[PDB]
């Protein structure tokens, strides 16, 4: 459950948030495969409540109606086709498994669902699964409101309704089998693994009991005996009874400390400086690298009120965001997930965005196609951070430098830092308000290297800055604080 099951030399996955299945499948073939991406995290593929107040919010997809693969992203045929086409070009599919809960208890009974299945939250009846009142935690939850009130009670966090979402009884073999039936259906279709949504709200033993029911991966695309990649969403910044290490036996865990700390450091908040990133990794109190799923932002916290609050960097802070992602992709700690978002009319009142519920770009609730501009950016309000040259090239950087040790660190005691990855790559950062002009040991073979942040290596020449490494491995770097991207990254495959 720790191995991503990616192809050799593909070290990152991208969260194609609210993307349609056919758009993802085409994206696998036209972009993700040639650009070296390892896999894709898909929005929950199972039927959810259609919520019209507010109008089709993104978070409606975390309120399951049933386990039918039938959503605003596509039907089972489109999903099967996406998984097949992606695997055939070497890009994996990881399913956001919403297994902790059904929809909210106060949702109106009826057929207002993405596949028209009937469901009655009031009576705990989901006949499309089927689930009944026996399959929920009404009895086990000891709290007055039936919801999660006190996060310092680990039992209530697990046994009660997350923001009123009906909490399944994962101790029962019947509930474990229906979830495993659903997950095994996705494994048989060919998915490489799962993001376990709201893992903090499930007991680790219940997770283990479910995972033990899972098949090995589809042998058409995976070696015999391959297990599904498991990364569990557990928000743990410390100081709470639930520790993300409690889930190490089931798979990797989302390290929400990663993006929280990295954002504060790069915003230069709270006296933090980039020079403190020298011991980045376990040194900062993070989970072991082999247990870590890392990211700058996720679909939730990029709206400002998730784990890490205002410190989370997003595409809205594009310049600072690119630096954080570049550092993450350059540093060997953890398995990196790149965020790919859509635009929404962010409207702040008292520092709170009242439109952070807005779902993907749509035409009367129908998600818009992802269109590609001639400059390779996206239209139809899709941000496609994964297609940004500065981020995409760093995804490749991580592939090129895979396995090479963190070495050759430099810092100025402030915010001008650099490091290398063995003899395969070097990266330099200037987050101070003055120029970075210095000659640094890169550890790279002598040659002319294309800076993959400001440009590309195309036809034996660079479209951006050129770095000249001498025979001693030294190279001079000159980065203005007014530079569009105040960081430079070179690697073995950007050498002319």
């Amino acid at each position: 459950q720790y191995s991503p099951n990616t192809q050799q030399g593909r070290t990152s996955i991208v969260h194609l948030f609210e993307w349609r299945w056919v758009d993802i499948a085409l994206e696998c073939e036209r972009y993700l495969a040639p650009k070296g991406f390892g896999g894709v995290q898909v929005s929950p593929p199972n039927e959810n409540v259609a919520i019209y107040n507010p109008f089709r919010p993104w978070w409606e997809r975390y309120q399951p109606v049933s386990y039918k693969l039938c959503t605003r992203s596509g039907n089972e045929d489109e999903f099967r086709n996406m998984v097949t086409r992606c695997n055939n070009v070497g890009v994996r599919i990881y399913v956001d498994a919403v297994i902790n809960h059904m929809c909210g208890n106060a949702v109106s009974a009826g057929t207002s669902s993405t596949c028209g299945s009937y469901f009655n939250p009031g009576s705990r009846d989901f006949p499309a699964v089927p689930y009944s009142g026996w399959d929920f935690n009404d009895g086990k939850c000891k709290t007055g409101s039936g919801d999660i009130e006190n996060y310092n009670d680990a039992t209530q966090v697990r046994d009660c309704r997350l923001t009123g979402l009906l909490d399944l009884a994962l101790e029962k073999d019947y509930v474990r089998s229906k979830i495993a039936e659903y997950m095994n259906h996705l494994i048989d279709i060919g998915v490489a693994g799962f993001r376990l949504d709201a893992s903090k709200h499930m007991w680790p033993g219940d997770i283990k009991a479910i995972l033990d029911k899972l098949h090995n991966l589809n042998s058409n695309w995976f070696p015999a005996g391959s297990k599904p990649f498991i990364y569990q969403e557990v928000i743990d910044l410390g100081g709470e009874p639930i520790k993300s290490s409690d889930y190490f036996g089931n798979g990797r865990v989302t390290e929400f400390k990663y993006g929280a700390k990295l954002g504060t450091v790069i915003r230069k908040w709270n006296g933090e400086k980039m020079s403190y990133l020298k011991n980045w990794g376990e040194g900062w109190g993070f989970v072991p690298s082999d247990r870590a799923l890392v990211f700058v932002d996720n679909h939730d916290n990029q709206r400002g009120h998730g784990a890490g609050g205002a410190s989370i960097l997003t595409f809205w802070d594009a310049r600072l965001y690119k630096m954080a992602v570049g550092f993450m992709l350059a540093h060997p700690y953890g398995f990196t997930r790149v965020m790919s978002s859509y635009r929404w009319p962010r409207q702040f009142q008292n520092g709170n965005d009242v439109n952070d519920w807005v779902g993907p770009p749509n035409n009367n609730g129908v998600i818009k196609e992802v269109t590609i501009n001639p400059d390779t950016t996206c239209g139809n309000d899709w941000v496609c951070e994964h297609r940004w040259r500065q981020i995409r090239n760093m995804v490749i950087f991580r592939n090129v430098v895979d396995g090479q040790p963190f070495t050759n660190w430099y810092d100025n005691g402030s915010n001008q830092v650099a490091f290398g990855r063995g003899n395969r790559g070097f990266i330099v950062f200037n987050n101070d308000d003055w120029s970075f002009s210095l000659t640094l040991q890169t550890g790279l073979p002598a040659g002319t290297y294309c800076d993959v942040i400001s440009g590309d290596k195309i036809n034996g020449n660079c479209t951006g800055i050129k770095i000249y490494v001498s025979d001693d491995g030294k190279a001079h770097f000159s980065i203005s604080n007014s530079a569009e991207d105040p960081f430079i990254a070179i690697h073995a495959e950007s050498k002319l």
Partner: peptide, 18 residues
């Protein structure tokens, strides 16, 4: 319930707190 552990964004939380 409070404002400590917000999930699904601010707008969802405000409607949940009500």
């Amino acid at each position: 319930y409070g404002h400590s552990h917000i999930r699904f964004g601010y707008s969802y939380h405000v409607s949940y707190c009500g």
